[PDB]
Design a protein around this ligand. Structure first.
Ligand code: PC1
Ligand code: 3PE
Ligand code: 3PE
Ligand code: ZMP
Ligand code: LMT
Ligand code: LMT
Ligand code: LMT
Ligand code: LMT
Ligand code: LMT
Lengths: 73, 494, 38, 81, 64, 670, 98, 72, 85
């Protein structure tokens, strides 16, 4: 497109940026990549979701004064 | 005719004039670009006329036209406070989106202007339609122009980027279509007035939810389904990037106020912990991986994923504050993401031909006007007070905490992580040492074009931050209609 | 070591007329010392 | 010793050692607009400050001279017997 | 037991003193003389004490 | 007038920043300095207005946020606590401005610097004058943005860019907890205005007050640099010295203390937070007194001295004597600003060297600076009848005055922390002025002695004192450091004083310990800090001047080698933060980017469906050989499968297994 | 090799002495002692023992390293280092339009 | 010894002047002009917000109680 | 403005004059050599460059310190440094 100004393009940084862009073409299923993938995609969301279900509607703070309890349920 | 149909015809009339001017003169490309820009300004003047006349506390759709003739598919236009500000945002962005990319196109300029003038009509329609199949019709008519915008005027990885956006958006939106077709079968029409009266059985609602949420989760987008945006936004031209982030990412946000809050309430209530679990995860993961991104324009795109998650948890709060905060954070994202894309895709890429943060350092020393605006747009991305972005996040985060406290507590960590990446990007480009040594020759600072669109976008972000009541007074009564719940002494009055 | 050998309070708690219950918010609010145990 | 700097760089804050020869005239003009702006916010304060207790007649309180709520009070109190 | 280097920390600390002979002795002698003698360094460590002490005694003698 | 105090510093900032070219360095300095001088005068009047007459002032301009139950205004309240904070904020801001004309004279960018100074004063005014917690948060964030802008003023230096990241992000951690705490207030009471929150506080659920108080306290660590979130405050010494005098040691650091003092009508109804406030305070005093005694930078010592005094005020807040903490807050900003402006003056004289190991003599070369910093150091150690005597020594006897285990504990802890304060006060005053010269002759070579022949006209540079714009602030702050405590002891300490009787500082009759602190505390503990200061000061002077070998013996022992490096490295808190928190987050970002986003999400997604389907489609497409004989066989095969299915009444699922088997057989090559 | 290396270690061990002992008089006596230990080994020739005495010195420089060694102010690691670093390119921008 | 003020605003060297690219006309007159005209019009827009309506009724209910004084 | 040759020379002359390891204070000139003109050992010259480093508050890297074996080479180096006091 438009001519840009002159940049001393570092061959080392250019090939690094090329590496980051095409990296997916080389992902494999190992014992390690599965372990990290299972932790992040299943375990953490399932733990966050489980606490979300258990504590849902558990507490309300509006207008609650002394002698009342925060716990709805 | 109505005034909402004038909004649609003007961008169509501009398409006709660009196509026929060569038949009256070999005409310059500068003449094609003035036609497209004057056409977008007139749509913005009409839209400001509509907003002057608009009734801020009316439960009837306004500026409608008496059809009186019914067919299988018929266009029905109306405006409510829930949609007026989405229309205004579309009509303020499109003029800037054209001005921002005024010199950068160079080849196929008529085609470029025609696609944007066509996109403006299709994105305006999706907010104005009063049926849910008509909503789907325009919510998905934008996919052919965007496939060709990226392919003709995109960057190096454009072919894959354009295949990703089309196929993900096509796949995700075909689960929405199945849910819409089911509701039409049970009720006999998708016109909003008739659909909102109708109450579905819980099981139907729980399966209509599975299918509208699958569509919205792909189009939000959520963390494991955001690959299309990381490609689409970056490889898109500057102008396409501005539209896709500011206006297209908001179509799913406005689609919850129509397809979920009023017609599937029990499903939305009993499934919010699934939404919040996803929304929390996409707040954290998106933010952790925005810290390690080495492409600047892809660092702006990843930031959008984290913000969309705050406004998604806000739309699922069943609270007046989180619902209005969700609309405020979507309006706020429209201005700030536009500016950060203009900085990364339209100033750095214009002068260097690179997007790698390795090559940029100390840019404040030679470009002091760019660094001032760049700092303000980074602070708004970080949700600093005095910008509209803070108000939307605070209200979106409060309704999230009031609905299910724990998830809003994780979601509140966005205050530390949005700040982390925003300042880190800033300190590495504007600051971070002296002007880089990879710059062989000096770079000029902001042009009077670059300055005045950045100034305009920053001006909207700050003024609306000081007095958000410019937008809040319009949404109050209409937001009041999408809340589900009763209070024991305020209900069932005799 | 401080918990083993630290002084006891040397003066009795100061006593208020009526516990100042009105001036501190009424019966539905906490008040000051008023002829109680120690 | 002053740092060598590029002379094509335009900054709203001046840049590296920027003092115009009209600095005094421009500074005088900015002073008046500051004084004029701060004169409007003062008259806003006078008519919009809210007090729930008025000052004593003989007790030093220079607000007595420009705030309308006090001036309304002290003029009303200056009517007796 | 001793290291191959002749370094012993007990002997190192023994020499932490002012050496009797020093090749650099005269190059450093300016830091302990003149303005930098013991007296001169602490001559004015309490600036106003001398003026204040006699002045306060004048006020202190108010019985007469 | 009241709304004009707010407006003036803002206007001077805008002229200096966006119009520096038109006004120049001189015009920017004049407008910036004059606007904050005028604001200072109008604020001294407002102290007589509001405090001495008990007339709170309310002004609302327009609404900021308008919703259901949420109405937050651009409104300002002036009460006794507001005008109390405004005096140190605006006196120190005015003087640092005048000071900065001399200190930053040689710097290229003066308009940008002075613009940031006025921007900080405006934000600090917003923080103390707001009607509600959400507008106070605007000043809180604003002061944070201004501290980032001033720590990173020299953007070319990478160290400065790291230290400004620390200030910005360690304060965002506190902001997250205040945002949660303000959500709790809106959720419980429906609005976060001060009058609303305090009127209703006695009746709210006691556990709801726990949640708010803890969140208010956590947010208070970051800004007040308490031990949990304090790593940023010593790194903020990268910015120019006048920045460290106002923002990093006399105003912004106190905002956390102001937040608890303002929230007194609420956190008084939760004694659980009051224990946390108290122990938080005592830890930070010994944590930072120990560190400062082993530092070699003068600014680092004076930065760790400030955090020892901030720990004193938080101790007083948890002791439930807010007037005492407010008294210390105002008194400290006079002598901490003095020591920083005095240290800045010796850095200026000695060629920007900040290391004690290269400073010596200088007492005859900088007489005013030495005496003025002697003024400041005597009130820092609370020498009797100084300004700091009435504030710091009442916190100690009030801790013992609350005859509890926690009070006697903090008295012992704080007294030990005072011992180390006396140690590093001697270190600063001995090694910079009283010790033998430890730096090059260039600072000490005069013209009274001829070292040259043909260059006598120039080239001596012997550590001279600065000019009028430098010394004037130092003299004024010296007079404050001697007398301000005495002249205001009644307004704050008193015995039944009614200065804060507009509920700006609410003490609940249950928590009052004033009368016992006046009478119960024995004279020994009342006088105990004094003997310790006088005894240690002479002991450290002998070990630094007379017997200098002994400390060499300590650091050359393996026991003392570890003890010297432990406190020099700041309890290794920086070490464990980068290695286990900061680097952990950067690894987590990489693992998500490398293994999930660019890994399994594309493999179990578009890229794995692409490479899987293209392989499948080539295999099925290889069944089509354009042989009529083989196509005829296919039609018969597809005929028989239809006949079997619709005559054997097979379960439809048996068909789907066939299709999935068939499709996956074409998925395998060869 | 093996000479500037032993002279770098000689300058280094004299800086570590002044870093721990802040007083120059006292470090002066320490400085004469470290010389004696280098001057005690001015007739070592075989590389088997030559490099062992450098390897074991490098251990004593780490064993007694200062937590905060002194750095001159304008030096890398110093307080005013990189403070107002000039633009490395003062030539006007080449004439291109964006 | 302060230096003269310097720089090229918009990159225009001290010789020549700013050359109008084409966008300037519509963007200054139409885009911004519409916003000032919208701003002046917005002042005379009648207030149809729910709160201005709800405040006035709310005052008439609390006036029927000792909470708010009535002018009658 | 900056450092002058006469200013740097007077300071190094007084530095080497006060060092007992120089053979004679008289034969210290701008072009004096440490090894033979002044008669200094391989360790005395390391001490000398440390004293020069202290005088000007600069740092001499090992690469640059090995080059300093004469007065003139030292004078040039101090003037090649825009960081000397
Ligand atoms: C109001 C004060 C505005 C000051 C603007 C100063 C300026 O122009 O800087 C240009 C300066 C350059 O001015 P300069 O005069 O130093 O330029 C000299 C030459 N160079 C370019 C090498 C520095 O550039 C920057 O450093 C920009 C950094 C961002 C500054 C942002 C200031 C406003 C922040 C608002 C905070 C809002 C918080 C709300 C809560
Ligand atoms: C650092 C901050 C710098 C601020 C610089 C700009 C200052 C603007 C000052 C505007 C002053 C408006 C004075 C209005 C008096 C009140 C009359 C009124 O009702 O106006 C309506 C609207 C909201 O104000 P209100 O409802 O009264 O809120 C209660 C607190 N009084 O009040 C309004 O009219 C406000 C509408 C525009 C607000 C400004 C938005 C752009 C800034
Ligand atoms: C990384 C992850 C956001 C952060 C969380 C919200 C803030 C804290 C919420 C928990 C505490 C509040 C609920 C407590 C419920 C309860 O029943 O606790 C009562 C108890 C005090 O009981 P009592 O002394 O009788 O009360 C005063 C009577 N005059 O209360 C207690 O004793 C509570 C226990 C002490 C809590 C101290 C602070 C703990 C902070 C933990 C980390 C937070 C991050
Ligand atoms: P000139 O050229 O005549 O001599 C220069 C040298 C000595 C390099 C000669 O060229 C030479 O003979 N080289 C051989 C080097 C060699 O093997 N031995 C010389 C001594 S090396 C050494 O390290 C000796 C021991 C020193 C021990 C003390 C230093 C460390 C103390 C601890 C740190 C400081 C206290 C905290
Ligand atoms: C549902 C289908 C998808 C719809 C998506 C929207 C597509 C919109 C495309 C715009 C219309 C085509 O745009 C058309 O581009 C061609 C490019 O060859 C132009 O044609 C001309 O282009 C340039 C103009 O200098 C000439 O050099 C070229 O020789 C000539 O062919 C037309 O003048 C323009 O009108
Ligand atoms: C991933 C793919 C998940 C499976 C695809 C979605 C299945 C949805 O199909 C779902 O099936 C149940 C089974 O009766 C039906 O759900 C409902 O049907 C009728 C309502 O008309 C009710 O009488 C019935 O009680 C209820 O379960 C609907 O047909 C549909 O809601
Ligand atoms: C602001 C965001 C966060 C807000 C939402 C979180 C609020 C957390 C509230 C925790 C307290 C809820 O309410 C609390 O529940 C606990 C049990 O768990 C109970 O606690 C009870 O425990 C014992 C029995 O074990 C009782 O005899 C005692 O009276 C009481 O302390 C009470 O019911 C109440 O004190
Ligand atoms: C939920 C799961 C996913 C939902 C659906 C999303 C599916 C998206 C799949 C898109 C697959 C990519 O689509 C395919 O990409 C390759 C690039 O590698 C393109 O290939 C093109 O780009 C390459 C890049 O080197 C160039 O040589 C050339 O321009 C062309 O061959 C194909 O033209 C396109 O068809
Ligand atoms: C948050 C996650 C959201 C996911 C949403 C749904 C995404 C699409 C689901 C199916 C994706 C396709 O999944 C992918 O299929 C093809 C099958 O040929 C496989 O692709 C690969 O198989 C093996 C690797 O095991 C390779 O040797 C082979 O070259 C390649 O074809 C992958 O093993 C699988 O990961």
């Amino acid at each position: 497109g438009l001519q840009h100004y002159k940049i001393a393009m570092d061959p080392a940084l250019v090939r690094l940026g090329s590496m980051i862009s095409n990296r997916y073409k080389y992902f494999r299923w190992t014992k390690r990549t599965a372990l990290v993938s299972f932790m992040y995609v299943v375990v953490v969301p399932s733990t966050i979701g489980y606490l979300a279900y258990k504590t849902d509607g558990l507490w309300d703070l509006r207008a609650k004064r002394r002698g009342d309890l925060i716990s709805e349920r | 005719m109505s005034l909402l149909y004038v909004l649609l015809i003007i961008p169509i009339i501009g398409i006709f004039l660009i196509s026929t001017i060569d038949s009256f003169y070999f005409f310059n490309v500068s003449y094609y670009k003035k036609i497209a820009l004057i056409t977008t300004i007139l749509n913005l003047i009409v839209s400001l006329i509509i907003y002057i006349l608009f009734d801020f506390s009316n439960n009837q759709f306004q500026f409608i036209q008496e059809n009186l003739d019914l067919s299988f598919y018929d266009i029905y236009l109306g405006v409510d406070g829930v949609s007026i500000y989405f229309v205004l945002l579309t009509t303020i962005i499109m003029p800037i989106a054209l001005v921002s990319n005024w010199n950068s196109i160079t080849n196929n300029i008529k085609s470029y202007l025609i696609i944007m003038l066509l996109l403006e009509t299709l994105l305006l329609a999706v907010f104005l339609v009063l049926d849910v199949l008509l909503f789907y019709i325009f919510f998905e008519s934008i996919l052919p122009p965007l496939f060709i915008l990226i392919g003709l005027f995109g960057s190096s990885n454009k072919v894959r980027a354009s295949f990703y956006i089309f196929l993900y958006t096509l796949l995700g939106s075909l689960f929405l279509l199945l849910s819409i077709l089911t509701m039409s079968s049970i009720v006999g029409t998708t016109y909003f007035d008739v659909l909102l009266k109708s109450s579905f059985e819980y099981t139907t609602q729980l399966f209509l939810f599975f299918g509208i949420f699958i569509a919205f989760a792909v189009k939000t987008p959520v963390w494991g389904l955001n690959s299309w945006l990381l490609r689409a936004h970056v490889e898109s031209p500057l102008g396409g990037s501005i539209v896709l982030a500011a206006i297209v990412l908001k179509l799913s946000l406005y689609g919850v106020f129509r397809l979920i809050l009023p017609i599937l309430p029990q499903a939305s209530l009993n499934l919010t912990y699934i939404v919040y679990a996803i929304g929390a995860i996409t707040v954290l993961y998106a933010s952790f991986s925005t810290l390690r991104t080495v492409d600047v324009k892809e660092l702006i795109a990843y930031s959008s994923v984290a913000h969309a998650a705050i406004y998604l948890m806000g739309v699922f709060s069943n609270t007046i504050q989180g619902l209005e905060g969700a609309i405020l954070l979507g309006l706020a994202h429209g201005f700030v993401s536009s500016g950060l894309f203009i900085c990364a895709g339209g100033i750095l890429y214009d002068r260097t031909g690179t997007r790698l943060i390795y090559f940029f350092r100390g840019l404040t020393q030679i470009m002091p006007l760019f660094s001032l605006f760049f700092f303000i747009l980074c602070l708004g991305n970080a949700g600093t007070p005095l910008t509209l972005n803070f108000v939307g996040e605070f209200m979106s985060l409060y309704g999230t905490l009031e609905r299910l406290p724990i998830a809003g507590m994780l979601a509140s960590t966005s205050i530390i992580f949005s700040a982390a990446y925003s300042i880190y990007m800033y300190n590495r480009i504007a600051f971070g040492g002296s002007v880089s040594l990879y710059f062989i020759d000096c770079f000029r600072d902001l042009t009077k074009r670059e300055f005045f669109i950045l100034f305009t976008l920053v001006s909207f972000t700050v003024i609306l931050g000081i007095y958000p009541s410019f937008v809040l007074d319009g949404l109050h009564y209409n937001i009041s209609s999408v809340v589900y719940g009763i209070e024991p002494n305020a209900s069932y009055l005799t | 070591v401080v918990k083993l050998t630290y002084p006891d309070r040397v003066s009795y708690p100061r006593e208020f007329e009526g516990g100042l219950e009105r001036e501190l918010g009424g019966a539905g609010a906490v008040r000051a010392f008023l002829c109680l145990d120690d | 010793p002053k740092i060598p700097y590029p002379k094509h760089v335009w900054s709203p804050a001046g840049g590296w050692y920027a003092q115009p020869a009209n600095w005094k005239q421009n500074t005088a003009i900015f002073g008046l607009v500051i004084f004029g702006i701060t004169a409007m916010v003062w008259k806003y304060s006078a008519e919009h400050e809210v007090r729930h207790k008025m000052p004593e007649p003989d007790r030093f309180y220079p607000s007595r001279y420009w705030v309308k709520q006090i001036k309304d009070y002290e003029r009303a109190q200056k009517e007796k017997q | 037991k001793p290291n191959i280097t002749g370094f012993d920390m007990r002997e190192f600390l023994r020499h932490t003193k002012t050496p009797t002979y020093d090749p650099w002795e005269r190059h450093e002698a300016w830091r302990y003389t003149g303005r930098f003698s013991r007296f001169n360094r602490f001559k004015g460590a309490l600036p106003g004490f001398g003026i204040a002490t006699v002045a306060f005694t004048a006020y202190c003698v108010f019985e007469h | 007038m009241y709304l004009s105090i707010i407006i003036l510093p803002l206007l001077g900032s805008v002229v200096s920043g966006f119009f520096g070219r038109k006004v120049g360095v001189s015009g920017a300095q004049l407008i910036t300095c004059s606007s904050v001088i005028i604001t200072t005068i109008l604020s001294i009047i407002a102290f007589f207005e509001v405090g001495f007459n008990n007339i709170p002032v309310t002004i609302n301009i327009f609404r900021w946020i308008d919703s259901e139950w949420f109405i937050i205004n651009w409104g300002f309240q002036y009460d006794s606590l507001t005008v109390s904070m405004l005096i140190p904020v605006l006196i120190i801001s005015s003087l640092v401005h005048i000071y900065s004309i001399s200190y930053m004279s040689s710097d290229p960018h003066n308009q940008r610097f002075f613009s940031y100074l006025s921007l900080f004063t405006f934000m600090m005014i917003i923080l103390v004058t707001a009607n509600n917690y959400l507008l106070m948060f605007v000043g809180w964030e604003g002061v944070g943005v201004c501290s980032y802008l001033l720590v990173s003023f020299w953007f070319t230096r990478i160290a400065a860019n790291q230290s400004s990241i620390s200030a910005f992000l360690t304060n965002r951690v506190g902001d997250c907890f205040l945002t949660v705490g303000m959500f709790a207030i809106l959720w419980s009471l429906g609005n976060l205005d001060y009058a609303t929150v305090f009127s209703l506080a006695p009746y709210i659920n006691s556990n709801v007050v726990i949640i708010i108080g803890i969140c208010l306290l956590i947010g208070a660590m970051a800004k007040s640099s308490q031990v949990g979130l304090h790593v940023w405050l010593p790194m903020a010494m990268e910015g120019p010295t006048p920045v460290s005098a106002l923002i990093h040691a006399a105003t912004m650091v106190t905002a956390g203390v102001y937040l608890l003092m303002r929230s007194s009508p609420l956190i008084e109804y939760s004694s659980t937070v009051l224990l946390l406030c108290l122990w938080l305070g005592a830890i930070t005093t010994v944590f930072s007194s120990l560190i400062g005694l082993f530092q070699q930078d003068i600014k680092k010592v004076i930065a760790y001295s400030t955090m020892s005094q901030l720990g004193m005020m938080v101790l007083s807040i948890g002791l439930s004597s807010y007037n005492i903490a407010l008294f210390h807050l105002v008194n400290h900003a006079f002598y901490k600003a003095l020591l920083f402006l005095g240290a800045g003056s010796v850095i200026h004289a000695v060629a920007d060297n900040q290391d004690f190991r290269k400073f010596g003599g200088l007492i005859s070369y900088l007489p005013l600076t030495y005496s003025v910093m002697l003024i400041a150091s005597l009130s820092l150690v609370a020498f009797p009848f100084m300004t700091g005597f009435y504030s710091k020594d009442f916190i100690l006897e009030s801790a013992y005055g609350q005859f509890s285990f926690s009070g006697v504990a903090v008295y012992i802890i704080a007294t030990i922390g005072a011992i180390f304060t006396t140690l590093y006060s001697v270190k600063v005053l001995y090694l910079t002025f009283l010790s033998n010269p430890n730096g090059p002759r260039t600072y000490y070579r005069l013209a009274i002695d001829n070292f040259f022949s043909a260059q006598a006209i120039k080239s001596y540079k012997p550590a001279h004192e600065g000019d009028f714009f430098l010394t004037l602030p130092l003299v004024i702050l010296a007079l404050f450091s001697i007398f301000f405590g005495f002249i205001t002891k009644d307004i704050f300490i008193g015995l039944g004083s009614n200065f804060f009787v507009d509920n700006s500082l609410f003490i609940h009759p249950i928590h009052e310990i004033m009368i016992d602190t006046e009478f119960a505390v024995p004279v020994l503990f009342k006088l105990l800090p004094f003997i310790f200061t006088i005894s240690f000061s002479v002991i450290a002077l002998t070990l630094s001047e007379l017997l200098s070998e002994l400390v060499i013996y300590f650091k050359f022992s393996r026991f003392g080698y570890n003890i010297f490096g432990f406190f020099n490295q700041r309890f290794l808190i920086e070490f464990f933060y980068n290695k286990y928190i900061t680097n952990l987050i950067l690894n987590l970002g990489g693992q998500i980017t490398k293994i999930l986003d660019k890994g399994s999400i594309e493999l179990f997604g578009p890229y794995g469906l692409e490479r899987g389907l293209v392989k499948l489609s080539k295999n099925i497409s290889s069944l089509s050989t354009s042989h009529v004989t083989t196509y005829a066989l296919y039609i018969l095969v597809g005929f028989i499968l239809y006949l079997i299915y619709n005559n054997l009444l097979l379960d439809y699922s048996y068909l789907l297994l066939i299709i999935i088997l068939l499709l996956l057989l074409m998925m395998i090559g060869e | 090799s093996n000479r500037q290396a032993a002279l770098s270690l000689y300058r280094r061990a004299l800086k570590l002495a002044l870093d721990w002992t802040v007083h120059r008089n006292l470090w002066r006596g320490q400085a004469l002692y470290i010389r004696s230990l280098f001057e005690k080994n001015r007739n070592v020739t075989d590389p088997r023992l030559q490099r062992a005495l450098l390897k074991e010195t490098e251990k004593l420089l780490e064993k007694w390293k200062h937590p905060d060694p002194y750095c001159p102010p304008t030096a890398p690691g110093g307080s005013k280092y990189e403070r107002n670093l000039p633009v490395p390119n003062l030539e006007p921008p080449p004439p291109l339009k964006f | 010894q302060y230096d003269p003020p310097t720089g090229w605003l918009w990159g225009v060297r001290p010789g020549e002047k700013y050359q109008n690219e084409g966008w300037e006309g519509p963007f200054f007159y139409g885009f911004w002009g519409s916003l000032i005209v919208f701003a002046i019009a917005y002042a005379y827009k009648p207030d149809t917000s729910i709160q201005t309506w709800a405040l006035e009724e709310a005052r008439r209910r609390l006036e029927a109680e000792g909470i708010l004084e009535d002018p009658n | 403005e900056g450092l002058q040759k006469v200013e740097v020379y007077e300071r190094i002359k007084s530095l080497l004059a006060g060092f007992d390891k120089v053979n004679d204070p008289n034969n210290i000139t701008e072009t004096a050599h440490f090894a033979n003109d002044l008669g200094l050992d391989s360790l005395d010259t390391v001490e000398v460059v440390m004293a020069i480093e202290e005088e000007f508050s600069i740092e001499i890297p090992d690469k640059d310190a090995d080059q300093i074996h004469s007065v003139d080479k030292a004078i040039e180096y101090i003037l090649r440094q825009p960081d000397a006091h």
